[PDB]
Write a protein that binds this ligand. Structure first.
Ligand code: NA
Length: 240
């Protein structure tokens, strides 16, 4: 997250860190959202590589013991069947991960609430992106979980020619694009939290930014629109 602030450690208890095994260690690669005690929602592109993955819930500082973490292996990966890795602009950038164990819920570990199917945010709706991604274009990962305020940009504006044009689809949410705050590499797969009727819900799964940089004016961060995938999500969990 570029232009973020450090999150309080109990603000976003559904945020997870998706990590892969790297030699004798583990490395953060993506975010995700805990949606059941044994299921995580992330981006499909995060799990393209044939790596060994684990999820960390209750994580705040990637580089220090928080005293709150639970580490669980990924047992099954279900990518959206229409996902195509060399065409992120087509959409379907979503995957579900079944965890090897069910995690224990507490003030640091909670299920993300998802929007009702079909919900579309009005333009300029208040949302936060969260994650441990790069803090500058071509920079380095954050140590501590970051948040940035990214108001939505509706489809009509986002798909206009000076924004993303044809690359953005109605199955996506755009947010930000002010040139200061944005998602960045390592935030993919994580949540966009939007306040609706008094309650935060996870409306987006972080999908892509511009090849020109993370924080680029009129290139808002683009997210998979979770409310377009409610039936898919429920069908996968019910059949696994
Ligand atoms: Na930690």
């Amino acid at each position: 997250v570029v232009g973020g602030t450090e999150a309080q450690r109990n603000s976003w208890p559904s945020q997870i860190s998706l990590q892969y095994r790297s030699g004798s260690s583990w490395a953060h690669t993506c975010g995700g959202t805990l949606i059941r005690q044994n299921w995580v929602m992330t981006a499909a592109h995060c799990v393209d590589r044939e790596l060994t993955f684990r999820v960390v819930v209750g994580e705040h500082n990637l580089n220090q013991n928080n005293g709150t973490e639970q580490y669980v292996g990924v047992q099954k990966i279900v990518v959206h069947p229409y996902w195509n890795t060399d065409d992120v602009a087509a959409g379907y950038d979503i995957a579900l991960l079944r965890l090897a164990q069910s995690v224990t819920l507490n003030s640091y570990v909670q299920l993300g609430v998802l929007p009702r199917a079909g919900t579309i945010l009005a333009n300029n709706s208040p949302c936060y992106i969260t994650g441990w991604g790069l803090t500058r274009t071509n920079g380095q990962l954050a140590q501590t979980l970051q948040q940035a305020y990214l108001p939505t940009v509706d489809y009509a504006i986002c798909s206009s020619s000076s924004y993303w044009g044809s690359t953005v689809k109605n199955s996506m949410v755009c947010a930000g694009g002010d040139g200061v705050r944005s998602g960045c590499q390592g935030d993919s797969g994580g949540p966009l939290h939007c306040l609706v009727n008094g309650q935060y819900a996870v409306h987006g799964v972080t999908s892509f930014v511009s090849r020109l940089g993370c924080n680029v004016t009129r290139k808002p961060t683009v997210f998979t629109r979770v409310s377009a995938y409610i039936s898919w999500i429920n069908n996968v969990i019910a059949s696994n």
